[PDB]
Structures are given as C-alpha cells and as structure tokens.
C-alpha cells in the first residue's frame, strides 16, 4: 500500500533579490537619449510582478506578449532605453507610423519585439532650472541603424563654401536640444518612455518569472523537487549541526 501526496509539495529558492533598479530610479540625472548607458543585467528577475501596488505609469504596452504572460516566458537579455518625448508627439510616435521622428532619429527593425512604458515626469522634471543636458540629432546625412550612435559633430555643409568647423554660409548645426519653456502647458509636459529590447535568443534561459508557492506538510510522505533534482520523502526537523556551506 502506497501513500501519495495530497496535491504537491514544492519549495522555491530564497528571496533572490531583483535587479538593482533602485539606483537607476533614484539617479539624479537619467541617461540622455543620444547617449544611453548599456550594462548587462543578469542573476535577477523582472520587477513587474511587484508593480501591482505602486506608482502607475501612463501606459504599459507589450505587443509581443500580453502583460500577464511576462512571468510565463523566460528572459535572457534585459536592456532598457529610456528617453524623453513631447506629449503632442506621443500620438505621432508609434510602430509602423511614418513621420519625421521615425525617418531620422527613431529607427528600429520592422520585426522588433518589446514593451513600451511611458509615464509623466512633471512631478520630478518640474522646477529643475531648465537644465539643457538632454540633446538629440535633428538631421543627419543618413538614417541611423538600430543601436547606432553618431559621434561626428562637424558642421553640416549644405553649400559649396566649406564650414571649416565653424558657422558660415549654408552651414547647418545638426545637434539640438528641446527648449524648456516655463509657459508650457499640460500637453507640452515631457513624458519619459522606456523601450525594452531583447531577442530572447543567443543566450541561455536563466531568468524565470515568479511562480506561486504551495504549502508544506511534514510527517507525511510527499514528492519534492529541489534545484531540478526530484525525490520523495518526509520533511522533518533536526537539530544536528550542519556546515554553513
């Protein structure tokens, strides 16, 4: 005669603290759109599961997968590109939409998959004494490829007269920043947008989403699975000294 477990007995690893996004959220100055930090992230899990009770963002849209399926799909590469956009350009900015932004500075693969998270930064960007750190390239000699950056600051030569690195006739200055007008209305308030780019390929699947943990029973034979290794037995309490490692 064999006694089987009621439903199951499964235990998961410890807290396993998430990625150190606190430093990025609390960063005094976020990375500029033209120059965005690129640091590999691993040995952690996405923090979207804890955002149930928090500061809701303006929009959270995942075209590739539904918001509830994020925990059901493993992640390999986590790279977030944060930038600032104008409110009136939110409607004009979208995948598959032709426009000036899409043509020159916003270029991405047609099959790119990811999530878009937008939120109003007026609560923090306000009264910042109109810092001009943010900058962008309004015009360029060609279309920037994905994940590409331009380092050429030479004055663009439109006419036959050489610019010689200084302003002149038919000479254009490509680099430009978003003018901060204190009289800007609600619709002109800047909005911070983050796009998560990742292919989920070329790297091992190590990061997994949170999984619900059932209850534990003792003094009764039950199945268990620790670190992949499966077994069956009874879990009890022992006071025998054991090595910390």
């Amino acid at each position: 005669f064999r006694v089987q477990p009621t439903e199951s007995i499964v235990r998961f690893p410890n807290i396993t603290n998430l990625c150190p996004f606190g430093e990025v959220f609390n960063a005094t100055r976020f990375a500029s759109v033209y120059a965005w930090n690129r640091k590999r992230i691993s040995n952690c899990v996405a923090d979207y599961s804890v955002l149930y009770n928090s500061a809701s963002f303006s929009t959270f849209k995942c075209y590739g997968v539904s918001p509830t399926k994020l925990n059901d799909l493993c992640f390999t590469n986590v790279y977030a590109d944060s930038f600032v956009i104008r409110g009136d350009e939110v409607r004009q900015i979208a995948p598959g939409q032709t426009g000036k932004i899409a043509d020159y500075n916003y270029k991405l693969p047609d099959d790119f998959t990811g999530c878009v998270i937008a939120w109003n930064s007026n609560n923090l960007d306000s009264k910042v004494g109109g810092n001009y750190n943010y900058l962008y390239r309004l015009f360029r000699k060609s279309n920037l490829k994905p994940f590409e950056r331009d380092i050429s600051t030479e004055i663009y030569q439109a006419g036959s007269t050489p610019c010689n690195g200084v302003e002149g006739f038919n000479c254009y200055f490509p680099l430009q920043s978003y003018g901060f007008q204190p009289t800007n209305g609600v619709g002109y308030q800047p909005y911070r947008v983050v796009v998560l780019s990742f292919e989920l390929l070329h790297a091992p699947a190590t990061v997994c989403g949170p999984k619900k943990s059932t209850n534990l029973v003792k003094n009764k034979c039950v199945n268990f699975n620790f670190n992949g290794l499966t077994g069956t037995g009874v879990l009890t309490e022992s006071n025998k000294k054991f090595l910390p490692f």
Partner: nanobody
Amino acid sequence: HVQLVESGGGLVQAGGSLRLSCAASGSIFSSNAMSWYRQAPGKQRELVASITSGGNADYADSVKGRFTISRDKNTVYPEMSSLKPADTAVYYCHAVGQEASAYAPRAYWGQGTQVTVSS
C-alpha cells in the same frame, strides 16, 4: 570657456606611472561630447578618441588602453601608460557648445598641449 590646464609638467622616470587628476573647478559643466586628437609633424588631424556623456567611449587600436580618457560625474580622468620617445606629440580637445552664440558663436577649441619625452 573652460580651462583644462592643470600644471606645466614635471620630471618622468623610466617605466613610470602617473595618473593626473583633473581639477574639475570652474563654471557649471554640461553633458557635452568630448573628442581627443593627436597631432605631429607630417600628419593632419585624426579622430583618435571620442567619449560621449557617459554612454560609451571609442579609442583607436594604437592608443587603446595605454592612453585613455574616462568620464564620471562630470569629471574627466585620463589614464596614461606606455610612455615612449615616439609619443612626443600635441593633444587637442574638442567639445560641443550650444549656449555660446551670445558674443562668439564659435566652437571652444582648447589650445593644443605639447608633450615630449626625453631622458
């Protein structure tokens, strides 16, 4: 205008290792891209290195590692190594300035600093 000059120089011993620290004192700084160029007789200006506003830095293979510049918290740290007699050249620094059209709408081109190696 920003003056990056720190000191005239000093004696250097064979196989030395000096890590100069920029003063980083003056007016309010800005997130402007920086470019480092090398000049010498018989050669024109070349794009030796380019460091962005903390995003990433690109350096030539010849100057990779042994000569480098790092940007951190609005501070420039130069790393100097592999000192040889042939390194005698002139360093040029190029920056980007937008709010400079009030009286001189021209780029702030710092004076080239000459460096020579001789025992």
